[PDB]
Nucleic acid binder design. Structure first.
Lengths: 193, 174, 99, 203
RNA sequence: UGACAUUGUGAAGAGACAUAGAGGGCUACCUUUAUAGUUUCU
RNA sequence: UCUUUGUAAAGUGCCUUCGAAGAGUCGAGUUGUUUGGGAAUGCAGCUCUAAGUGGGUGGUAAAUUCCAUCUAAAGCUAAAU
RNA sequence: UUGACCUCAAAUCAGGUAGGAGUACCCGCUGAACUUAAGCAUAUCAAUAAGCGGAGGAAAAGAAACCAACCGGGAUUGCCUUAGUAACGGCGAGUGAAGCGGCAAAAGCUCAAAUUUGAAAUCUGGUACCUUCGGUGCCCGAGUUGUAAUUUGGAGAGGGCA
């Protein structure tokens, strides 16, 4: 029923929720299993860095616009500018993403620099050599970290010219709001002589 | 008709492809040739064979390579070749609807070919091919517009023909 | 196409250096080809029109394009398809009249 | 290159040639058995597009299924149920006529695997489909890795589990915002978002 | 019960869209003619 | 380990042409069911039924000066679950 | 007087395959009502139980006819979160996702649509030999109403250089 001054709570428990209860007792055991799987795959691929090299990309929306993070793979344009074919990049451990485009020069340079750094920092064993192992590292991500680009200096000179940056916002919003009506007026005035 | 079909299939049978035994003989002779003289695999003469295969022949017509194309009439799905007269008319390659996909299969050493085509000829029977093409075109390529206007079918059974005969006879008998 | 460099307005967004990436081949899907144009012309010449297109042609000739568009919208899906179909029938009657 | 012509012609479903062929072929299929073996596909281009290859181990079966709604198969009128469930007549089966066609074909030829199926004809009473099937035990398919994937046990009765093209369409297996209920599976999604997940240190 | 589909091929009459001629002192529902976008049943 | 079936399969600093891409299927209507999806989310039955700078989407139903984003109606695929 | 094709049959013909079990989990179909609404019919329970069909060690999904509206991300699947929110709802009782963000794991791809036409280059089977999960002689058959190589949209296709 309903009673004294209390919040209205919506506890969605009118189905047979007790059949669908997943209490994670296996958290510790699953962490152990995940570490064991990582170690076993490392032993399997013993010279290899246990993961692929990912590119730096920008987060999509306006809320995460500021952040730069790790994407899925490098653009075909990026691997071309680095100087590799897509298939060879995949074979020597560079993640390649075909569907991602670079409309951005800054991100293009950042990822080309990442590719050059990876090429310099890795050694490809020959197919018929002595396999000079080099104390495998386990994380391309940890050895090629994503760093947020520095946008500005800590101190600068005040450049004031008298628009207050609020009148600017108000006016830009106004032009966006009224552009269609203004185009209407212009077209009507051109049409009616 | 039967006579020109016989002439056309005689010409094509002279242009018949090579059997498996002949193919093995030719391959062995080329192996011997490239073993002893290191020949550039061109000691064997250029073949003169009737082109078969629906896709192959349609591509040849598209490329205007085909001198003459024979289209069977027994293909179970008609849409496989129903566009072929239109394609041959468009590309100016003489076509003839012939009787017997089994006949074409015997022609190309199979059970059924549904289409045959000559793209190249020998000079010894180029005149024969031209004479054949004249009559084949007289039947098919120039009467194409009339054949595309002419509607077929609509024939009734024996009893129905007799019934309409009786009705017409008793109507005009006055 | 450059952003205005502020957070609100018509082209709001950070002023970055654009790149205009190389067009993808998948974006070439609506392009007509000689092979498909040849095949379609030959197929239509060997097949011929359908009853609703025959009705559309006679409607264009006698009643008018507006009624043709109404009936084509009823027959096909939408106004865009009706427009394309009625214009195609206009092409057909133009070809018929010329030759 | 005759397959392009075949496909473009097939698109012209309402031409005189295709109407005539539709009439004669629909009569012939109606006069044949409800499920029968087809010596060859009537649409070779369609069969090749859907994955048929003209080699031993590939078979084609013609099937017709009754058209219309799925009448609720219970009178006695005694549901003691609500008026919302009281309806009988205008209820619609959630799987396609294609899906039931290939299920019946797979049950008939249970030794094969339903690769695909396509529409060939329809009348008021029946819809007609042709089902492409593959023999997992013929060596012409067991070798030649282009098609030996279907010889693995995970593909037993794809038509029954809804893994064919019609099956995935009916299951709603598509990317996008319009398929938020059915992407990984309707019931799997429901179970995942109706589970109560409790951690050792409660969050 | 109606419509649409199954569904394909030919025949007389009933409504508008007479541009016009038969009627009663700034004029009524009104029988009737070329029937080259149209009609279903008897 | 016996040896390469000594004309065995793969890239740009210049393109002579192109570039085939899934039809009773998209799509529209309507009916039932379903979804948080609301002038209708998916599915299915019936009717109609396409197109090539086309087609889908862009979460409010309807010509557009312009957009943006993919490429359906064919298919395989371990791991984390 | 004969030989073929097409389709359809027969055989205790040669060799195979399917069914049934189990079903905790998985993929679908079908499908309630008790119950809540302090009554009750939409709703709820619940796209659940029962019923039916079908797999595996996982299954399914899976390399965008995606998400977005950004300086754009980039197969799938899970966890945290979004969020008891946007929305739905006799707008009552109730119900109710998704994008982004962090992470676990990460992996990619191939057919149809192209004439090899200077050579069906492809493949089952029968019979022989051997190094037998098979490999080689030969023979028949399948197959041109299309089996190989070649290309799959990220691309890719009669050539020529340092």
């Amino acid at each position: 029923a309903i009673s004294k001054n209390l919040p209205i709570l919506k506890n969605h428990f009118r189905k047979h929720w007790q059949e669908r209860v997943k209490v994670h007792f296996d958290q510790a055991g699953k962490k152990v299993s995940r570490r064991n799987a990582r170690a076993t795959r490392a032993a399997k691929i013993a010279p290899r860095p246990l993961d692929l090299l990912r590119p730096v990309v920008r987060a999509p929306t306006v809320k995460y616009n500021r952040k730069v993070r790790a994407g899925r793979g490098f653009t075909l344009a990026e691997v071309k500018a680095a100087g590799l074919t897509a298939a060879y990049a995949r074979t020597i451990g560079i993640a390649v993403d075909h569907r991602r485009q670079n409309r951005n020069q800054e991100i293009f340079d950042a990822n080309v620099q990442r590719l050059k750094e990876y090429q310099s920092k890795i050694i490809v064993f020959p197919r018929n050599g002595k396999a000079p192992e080099a104390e495998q590292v386990l994380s391309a991500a940890a050895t090629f970290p994503i760093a947020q680009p520095a946008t500005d200096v800590e101190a600068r000179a005040v450049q004031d010219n008298g628009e207050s940056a609020f009148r600017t916002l108000r006016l830009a919003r106004s032009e966006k709001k009224f552009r269609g009506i203004r185009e209407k007026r212009a077209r009507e005035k051109a049409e009616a002589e | 008709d039967r006579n020109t079909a016989a002439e056309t299939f005689k010409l094509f049978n002279k242009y018949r492809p090579e059997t498996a035994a002949e193919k093995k003989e030719r391959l062995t002779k080329e192996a011997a040739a490239v073993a002893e003289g290191k020949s550039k695999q061109d000691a064997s003469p250029k073949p003169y064979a009737v082109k078969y295969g629906l896709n192959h022949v349609v591509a040849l017509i598209e490329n205007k390579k085909a001198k003459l194309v024979l289209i069977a009439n027994d293909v179970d799905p008609i849409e496989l070749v129903v566009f072929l007269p239109a394609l041959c008319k468009k590309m100016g390659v003489p076509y003839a609807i012939v009787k017997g996909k089994a006949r074409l299969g015997t022609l190309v050493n199979q059970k059924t070919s549904a289409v045959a085509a000559l793209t190249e000829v020998r000079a010894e029977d180029e005149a024969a091919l031209a004479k054949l093409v004249s009559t084949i075109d007289a039947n098919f390529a120039d009467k194409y517009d009339e054949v595309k206007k002419h509607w077929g079918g609509g024939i009734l059974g024996n009893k129905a023909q007799a019934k309409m005969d009786k009705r017409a006879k008793n109507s005009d008998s006055a | 196409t450059v952003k205005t460099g502020i957070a609100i307005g018509l082209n709001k967004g950070k002023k970055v250096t654009s790149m205009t990436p190389a067009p993808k081949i998948s974006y070439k899907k609506g392009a007509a080809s000689n092979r498909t144009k040849f095949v379609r012309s030959l197929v239509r010449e060997i097949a011929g029109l359908s009853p609703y297109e025959r009705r559309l042609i006679d409607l264009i000739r006698n009643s008018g394009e507006k009624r043709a568009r109404k009936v084509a919208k009823k027959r096909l899906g939408s106004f865009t398809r009706a427009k394309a179909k009625v214009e195609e029938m206009n092409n057909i009657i133009a070809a018929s009249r010329r030759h | 290159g005759a397959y392009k012509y075949l496909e473009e012609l097939q698109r012209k479903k309402q031409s005189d040639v295709l109407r005539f062929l539709q009439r004669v072929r629909v009569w012939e299929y109606r006069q044949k058995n409800v499920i029968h073996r087809a010596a060859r596909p009537t649409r070779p281009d369609k069969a090749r597009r859907l994955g048929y290859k003209a080699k031993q181990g590939f078979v084609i079966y013609r099937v017709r299924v009754r058209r219309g709604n799925r009448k609720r198969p219970v009178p006695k009128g005694a549901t003691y149920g609500k008026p919302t469930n009281q309806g009988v007549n205008e209820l619609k089966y959630q799987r396609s006529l294609r899906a039931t066609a290939e299920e019946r074909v797979g049950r008939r030829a249970a030794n094969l695997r339903v690769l695909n199926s396509y529409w060939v004809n329809q009348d008021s009473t029946y819809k007609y489909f042709e089902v492409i099937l593959v023999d997992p035990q013929h060596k012409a398919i067991r070798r030649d890795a282009r098609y030996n994937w279907i010889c693995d046990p995970v593909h037993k009765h794809r038509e029954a589990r809804g893994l064919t093209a019609t099956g995935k369409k009916s299951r709603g297996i598509n990317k996008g915002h319009k398929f938020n209920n059915t992407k990984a599976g309707r019931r799997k999604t429901w179970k995942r978002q109706n589970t109560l997940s409790l951690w050792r240190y409660r969050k």
